[PDB]
Amino acid sequence: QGVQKIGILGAMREEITPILELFGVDFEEIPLGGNVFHKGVYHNKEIIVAYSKIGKVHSTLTTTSMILAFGVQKVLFSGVAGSLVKDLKINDLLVATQLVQHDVDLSAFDHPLGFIPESAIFIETSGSLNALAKKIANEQHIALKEGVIASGDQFVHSKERKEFLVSEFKASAVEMEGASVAFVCQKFGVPCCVLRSISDNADEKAGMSFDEFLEKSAHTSAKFLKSMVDEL
Amino acid sequence: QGVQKIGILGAMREEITPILELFGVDFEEIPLGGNVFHKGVYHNKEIIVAYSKIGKVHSTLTTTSMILAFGVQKVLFSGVAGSLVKDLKINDLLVATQLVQHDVDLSAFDHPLGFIPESAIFIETSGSLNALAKKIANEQHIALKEGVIASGDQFVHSKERKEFLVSEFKASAVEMEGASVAFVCQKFGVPCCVLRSISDNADEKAGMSFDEFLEKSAHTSAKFLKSMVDEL
Ligand SMILES: C#CCSC[C@H]1CN(Cc2c[nH]c3c(N)ncnc23)C[C@@H]1O
Numbered sequence: 536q537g538v539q540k541i542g543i544l545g546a547m548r549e550e551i552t553p554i555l556e557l558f559g560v561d562f563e564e565i566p567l568g569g570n571v572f573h574k575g576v577y578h579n580k581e582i583i584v585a586y587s588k589i590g591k592v593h594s595t596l597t598t599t600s601m602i603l604a605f606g607v608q609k610v611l612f613s614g615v616a617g618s619l620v621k622d623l624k625i626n627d628l629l630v631a632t633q634l635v636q637h638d639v640d641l642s643a644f645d646h647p648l649g650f651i652p653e654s655a656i657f658i659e660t661s662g663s664l665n666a667l668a669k670k671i672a673n674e675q676h677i678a679l680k681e682g683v684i685a686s687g688d689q690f691v692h693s694k695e696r697k698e699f700l701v702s703e704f705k706a707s708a709v710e711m712e713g714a715s716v717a718f719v720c721q722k723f724g725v726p727c728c729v730l731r732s733i734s735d736n737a738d739e740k741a742g743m744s745f746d747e748f749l750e751k752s753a754h755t756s757a758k759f760l761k762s763m764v765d766e767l
Numbered sequence: 768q769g770v771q772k773i774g775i776l777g778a779m780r781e782e783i784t785p786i787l788e789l790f791g792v793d794f795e796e797i798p799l800g801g802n803v804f805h806k807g808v809y810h811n812k813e814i815i816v817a818y819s820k821i822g823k824v825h826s827t828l829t830t831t832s833m834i835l836a837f838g839v840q841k842v843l844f845s846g847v848a849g850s851l852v853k854d855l856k857i858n859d860l861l862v863a864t865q866l867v868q869h870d871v872d873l874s875a876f877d878h879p880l881g882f883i884p885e886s887a888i889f890i891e892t893s894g895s896l897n898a899l900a901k902k903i904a905n906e907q908h909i910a911l912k913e914g915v916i917a918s919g920d921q922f923v924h925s926k927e928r929k930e931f932l933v934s935e936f937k938a939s940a941v942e943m944e945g946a947s948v949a950f951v952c953q954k955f956g957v958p959c960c961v962l963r964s965i966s967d968n969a970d971e972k973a974g975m976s977f978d979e980f981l982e983k984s985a986h987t988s989a990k991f992l993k994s995m996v997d998e999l
């Protein structure tokens with residue numbers, strides 16, 4: 536019966552700018568492990584917001600810090616992603632049902648791609664939180680897609696790599712942090728939800744699309760994340 | 768003026784088996800975040816030993832746990848690695864002077880390979896600890912090499928990838944955890960030393976070589992790590 540502590544994560548500063556703005560509360564800035572954590576109070580909940588910096592190691596570190604140093608009981612991720620599928624268009628919102636580290640390769644020992652011993656290819660997120668996301672989206676008449684998100688330490692900008700992600704993992708979107716965030720949460724038994732809004736199509740024009748749409752797509756995701764926190 | 772707390776990390780159980788045996792003290796087993804931490808007392812020092820499990824996310828998580836949950840003031844890594852250079856042979860010992868995440872690719876935005884914004888290509892380890900390693904090796908007439916270690920989430924077993932690591936990063940050895948361990952330590956200001964003993968040549972026969980030499984190479988590294996702790 537303490538105050539609920541909720542971790543809110545993006546990868547880049549641009550993904551958390553709209554989060555901080557939308558909550559509209561005063562935040563205390565707390566430096567730790569190369570991150571700045573923004574700690575505020577919102578409707579009987581303590582919210583801790585940070586951007587991890589890009590990629591798997593950064594996001595793993597920051598999620599672990601949120602859990603161990605700030606005692607968060609849930610983690611919600613908001614940011615942008617590349618679309619791997621024709622029906623996911625720029626600005627569309629996706630909730631990740633499972634995530635994979637698409638760049639993991641222990642095939643020299645006959646392991647399937649994505650697999651590491653003492654783990655699994657696919658990492659699950661919270662069914663209760665994903666159900667909440669879907670409930671809210673239906674009530675607000677927001678198209679919310681669901682699917683597998685692939686995460687790796689490369690910005691994907693080729694037809695060939697996109698097609699690999701679809702064929703190998705049946706992934707719908709690609710990014711560089713979701714799987715590591717969801718993985719850390721699974722290891723600590725912390726409920727996790729990963730939201731992404733599409734910024735690009737992970738093809739040869741992805742860099743230019745990303746730079747154009749980062750702000751808008753980040754805001755779309757942030758607004759939805761806030762609507763979830765309103766129901767926690 | 769408290770007791771010095773030292774984190775001792777391997778990636779696989781096999782890399783820490785000789786560590787636990789060689790210290791020869793009683794350890795309390797403490798589960799946290801999917802790892803088991805072995806906490807013992809050795810010569811006015813508290814030693815916390817764990818294996819992270821394989822790869823960058825696992826090792827990032829465990830190093831962060833060591834620092835935040837166990838309060839370690841230094842981190843020493845011991846394990847095995849693939850050789851990228853003719854003069855590093857099976858069983859040889861290497862101390863990593865810098866490390867890189869060799870699989871990071873943000874070249875779509877004209878970043879050099881290995882680079883992430885708000886970080887650097889090369890991560891340094893502790894000069895004071897590396898100097899200690901070299902001093903001990905010279906006193907014991909142990910050949911200790913030094914160089915760049917490349918870390919990524921793939922087991923390297925091809926001429927083509929080996930040559931890339933040498934050309935791109937001037938790396939001497941390859942593994943899947945050193946850069947992430949050293950990175951976490953840098954972010955928290957914790958001195959880090961990464962030791963590796965060669966298990967294979969990162970070529971088409973690397974899997975078979977690794978399985979053959981894991982035990983012996985792990986022990987070689989562990990023995991050297993213990994000799995360092997004896998001087999702390
Ligand atoms: C320098 C620089 C920016 S790297 C890209 C950011 C955006 N994010 C999501 C993302 C959006 N589009 C992507 C794509 N095509 N591939 C990987 N990841 C993504 C992954 C990284 O945090």
Ligand SMILES: C#CCSC[C@H]1CN(Cc2c[nH]c3c(N)ncnc23)C[C@@H]1O
Nearest residue numbers: 778821847848849922923941942943969
């Ligand atoms: C399944 C399974 C085992 S994956 C290999 C282990 C050994 N380690 C070091 C290592 C030794 N040789 C290597 C190589 N050729 N490539 C990458 N890493 C390494 C990296 C991983 O922890």
Ligand SMILES: [N+]
Nearest residue numbers: 638688870920
């Ligand atoms: N990776």
